[PDB]
Amino acid sequence: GPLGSMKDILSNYSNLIYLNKYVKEKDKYINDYRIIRTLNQGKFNKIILCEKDNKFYALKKYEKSLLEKKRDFTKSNNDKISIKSKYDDFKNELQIITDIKNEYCLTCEGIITNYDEVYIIYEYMENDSILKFDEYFFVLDKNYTCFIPIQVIKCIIKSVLNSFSYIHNEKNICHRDVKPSNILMDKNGRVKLSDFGESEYMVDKKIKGSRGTYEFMPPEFFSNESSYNGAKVDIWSLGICLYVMFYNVVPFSLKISLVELFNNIRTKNIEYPLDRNHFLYPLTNFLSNEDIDFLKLFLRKNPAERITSEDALKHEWLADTNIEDLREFSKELYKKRKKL
Amino acid sequence: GPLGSMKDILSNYSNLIYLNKYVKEKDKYINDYRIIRTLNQGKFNKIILCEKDNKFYALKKYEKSLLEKKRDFTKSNNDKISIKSKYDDFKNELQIITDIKNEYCLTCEGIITNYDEVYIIYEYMENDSILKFDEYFFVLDKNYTCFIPIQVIKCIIKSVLNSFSYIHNEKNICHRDVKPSNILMDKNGRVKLSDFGESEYMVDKKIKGSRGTYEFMPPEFFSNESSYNGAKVDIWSLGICLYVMFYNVVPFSLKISLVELFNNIRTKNIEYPLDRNHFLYPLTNFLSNEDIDFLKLFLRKNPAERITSEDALKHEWLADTNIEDLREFSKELYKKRKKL
Numbered sequence: 001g002p003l004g005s006m007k008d009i010l011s012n013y014s015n016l017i018y019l020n021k022y023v024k025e026k027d028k029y030i031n032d033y034r035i036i037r038t039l040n041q042g043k044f045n046k047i048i049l050c051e052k053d054n055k056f057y058a059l060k061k062y063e064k065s066l067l068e069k070k071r072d073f074t075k076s077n078n079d080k081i082s083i084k085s086k087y088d089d090f091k092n093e094l095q096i097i098t099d100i101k102n103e104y105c106l107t108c109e110g111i112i113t114n115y116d117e118v119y120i121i122y123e124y125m126e127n128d129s130i131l132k133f134d135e136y137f138f139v140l141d142k143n144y145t146c147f148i149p150i151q152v153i154k155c156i157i158k159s160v161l162n163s164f165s166y167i168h169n170e171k172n173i174c175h176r177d178v179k180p181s182n183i184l185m186d187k188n189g190r191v192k193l194s195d196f197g198e199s200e201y202m203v204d205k206k207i208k209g210s211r212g213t214y215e216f217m218p219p220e221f222f223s224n225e226s227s228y229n230g231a232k233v234d235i236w237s238l239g240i241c242l243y244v245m246f247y248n249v250v251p252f253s254l255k256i257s258l259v260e261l262f263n264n265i266r267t268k269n270i271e272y273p274l275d276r277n278h279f280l281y282p283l284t285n286f287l288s289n290e291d292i293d294f295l296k297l298f299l300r301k302n303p304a305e306r307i308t309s310e311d312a313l314k315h316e317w318l319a320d321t322n323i324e325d326l327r328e329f330s331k332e333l334y335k336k337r338k339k340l
Numbered sequence: 341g342p343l344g345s346m347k348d349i350l351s352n353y354s355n356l357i358y359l360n361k362y363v364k365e366k367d368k369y370i371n372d373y374r375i376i377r378t379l380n381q382g383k384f385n386k387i388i389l390c391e392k393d394n395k396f397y398a399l400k401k402y403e404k405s406l407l408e409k410k411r412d413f414t415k416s417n418n419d420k421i422s423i424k425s426k427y428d429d430f431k432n433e434l435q436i437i438t439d440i441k442n443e444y445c446l447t448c449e450g451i452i453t454n455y456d457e458v459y460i461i462y463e464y465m466e467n468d469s470i471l472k473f474d475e476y477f478f479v480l481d482k483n484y485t486c487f488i489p490i491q492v493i494k495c496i497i498k499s500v501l502n503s504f505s506y507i508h509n510e511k512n513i514c515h516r517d518v519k520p521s522n523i524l525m526d527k528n529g530r531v532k533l534s535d536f537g538e539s540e541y542m543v544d545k546k547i548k549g550s551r552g553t554y555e556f557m558p559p560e561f562f563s564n565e566s567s568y569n570g571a572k573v574d575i576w577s578l579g580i581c582l583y584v585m586f587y588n589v590v591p592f593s594l595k596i597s598l599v600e601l602f603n604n605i606r607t608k609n610i611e612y613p614l615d616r617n618h619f620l621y622p623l624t625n626f627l628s629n630e631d632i633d634f635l636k637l638f639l640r641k642n643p644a645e646r647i648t649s650e651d652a653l654k655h656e657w658l659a660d661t662n663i664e665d666l667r668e669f670s671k672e673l674y675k676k677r678k679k680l
């Protein structure tokens with residue numbers, strides 16, 4: 001429940017490496033991993049692009065001394081308050097990173113540490129996340145629109161559903177923050193679920209309560225319930241990703257304000273126009289009945305009535321998934337990147 | 341409703357100055373206003389500390405070209421969506437800045453512009469805001485605690501209540517974002533309501549709907565209602581400021597997450613311990629029955645049952661307000677600042 005020190009957590013990890021930073025002719029290295037540049041400066045962690053041998057890697061750096069300040073207010077149990085730190089959250093994440101091994105999930109290849117700074121080694125998914133965000137979602141560039149083709153969307157969903165199978169059924173983990181920025185693609189058309197920073201071990205398939213990214217949170221969270229089926233939470237969020245992949249915009253969600261976001265999620269019907277509709281004005285092809293059908297199975301506001309991952313994978317809509325559409329898509333995308 | 345261009349809005353302002361920036365021996369000037377340093381770099385606007393003659397000023401810089409990109413999603417009316425910009429929001433703010441004149445409100449002394457960059461001139465409230473925030477609220481320093489004394493709190497509240505009288509009764513404006521960071525104090529013990537960036541003109545005392553800072557928003561906002569009495573919204577928020585002034589922490593609110601914030605506000609009883617309770621642990625005197633009584637009149641979850649500003653000003657609790665407590669407090673505070 002409340003885990004021990006980092007050392008304890010990692011004591012049974014069989015690829016824990018001693019931290020060794022150094023310079024060799026003004027290129028900075030982490031343990032043979034040559035630091036190229038940083039890919040993403042988060043508020044806390046941060047991912048680093050590196051090279052070792054001839055392969056490419058993304059190392060995620062956390063630091064104890066940094067996240068152990070930044071304390072918040074959890075629940076209570078005892079009503080005698082509760083005091084948690086972002087380092088406490090990371091311990092739980094660490095244990096998970098240590099447990100995940102699957103072709104459909106980003107899995108680390110080693111942990112480098114001094115028990116303060118921590119570098120988790122990951123393969124580098126050269127096509128980054130399936131969509132990118134700033135004021136809205138885009139594929140490659142904020143300037144030309146372009147929506148992901150359906151046949152490719154099919155592949156991605158089937159892929160992430162497969163990773164649900166692993167975490168939910170094999171590992172008993174609820175991902176708890178399934179969003180576009182967390183589905184990574186490589187050049188060859190592999191798609192992987194990543195960032196388990198919000199992930200928790202379920203108790204009888206139930207998850208703790210209310211945590212993740214607001215606009216991806218299910219109606220359940222706005223009830224009296226207090227417990228929710230982990231799987232259905234991740235299903236809902238994939239549904240949103242699906243909606244986002246269709247429209248390049250998040251459904252009822254959107255900025256300013258969040259009361260208006262939350263009075264919405266629990267009760268309100270999602271609008272299903274044609275690809276560009278919420279998007280014709282920022283820039284100053286389109287779907288078909290079946291596409292909206294499938295997607296609506298994910299966004300049943302009542303969770304016991306929401307689609308299973310099993311039913312999903314075996315639904316008619318995915319029965320014509322051709323992995324070659326994704327491989328071709330991913331290949332051309334990679335060719336369009338590093339051209340910028 | 342939908343106002344015109346900046347020129348139009350300002351056409352009947354009688355102290356609109358032509359922008360004139362220049363250097364005189366590597367001190368940068370705005371129109372005789374010598375730029376000292378910047379006080380607060382917001383996400384958009386920004387406030388500048390300046391000097392002219394021997395007086396001190398805080399100029400708030402906005403820019404058209406900057407906030408006209410940054411568009412969001414308002415309501416609809418027509419269900420044919422609605423597209424607003426942060427520059428649109430500022431037009432409404434501009435009209436208001438142009439209307440407010442009161443000893444209890446920060447009122448501009450001139451607007452300097454080229455119809456893109458805009459500098460609103462304000463007196464400089466040398467004691468800044470009544471409390472400061474980072475991970476929690478503090479008076480001067482994050483290291484020594486110290487709570488504002490009750491007799492001083494009395495003065496501040498009476499002061500802000502007075503400014504409600506002006507905006508609500510004389511001007512028909514709802515402030516809509518009453519919070520500690522917006523109540524400014526000078527060295528001499530004057531306290532002024534400021535930042536009308538969220539402020540709106542009421543229609544039959546009602547305000548539009550759901551806008552401001554989440555943790556200061558009233559229960560009404562979580563109903564079916566759609567319209568709320570402007571005054572009672574500002575009353576609620578002053579109540580929170582009061583709660584914050586008592587405990588140096590925001591009530592049920594607090595970070596992570598907001599569903600947990602909103603399932604709270606609408607239904608849930610506020611806890612009233614003694615000054616340091618939520619605060620004994622960050623740092624690793626105290627109130628009295630009457631104080632909590634008064635404050636509870638502000639935080640009636642039902643707005644038609646919440647305290648008036650009239651009743652407040654004439655309540656027993658303020659009947660012994662001694663302005664000299666604030667003047668002495670403000671004097672010593674100023675002496676403790678610029679000592680850092």
Ligand SMILES: Nc1ncnc2c1ncn2[C@@H]1O[C@H](COP(=O)(O)OP(=O)(O)NP(=O)(O)O)[C@@H](O)[C@H]1O
Binds near residue numbers: 039045106124
């Ligand atoms: N193995 C990888 N290959 C390529 N890009 C990556 C990889 N890992 C992370 N990234 C990029 O870095 C971003 C953020 O990484 P993440 O592990 O989600 O950190 P975070 O602090 O949780 N950020 P966010 O999830 O956006 O709040 C991802 O969205 C990717 O764009």
Ligand SMILES: Nc1ncnc2c1ncn2[C@@H]1O[C@H](COP(=O)(O)OP(=O)(O)NP(=O)(O)O)[C@@H](O)[C@H]1O
Binds near residue numbers: 469
């Ligand atoms: N006249 C003034 N004298 C002294 N300090 C000031 C003055 N005006 C603004 N400030 C400081 O600048 C801060 C932010 O100014 P404000 O006009 O609220 O901009 P903002 O972008 O709305 N920031 P926030 O309200 O915190 O989201 C205030 O909280 C004060 O600390």
Ligand SMILES: [Mn+2]
Binds near residue numbers: 181182
């Ligand atoms: Mn992430």
Ligand SMILES: [Mn+2]
Binds near residue numbers: 521522534535
């Ligand atoms: Mn403000």
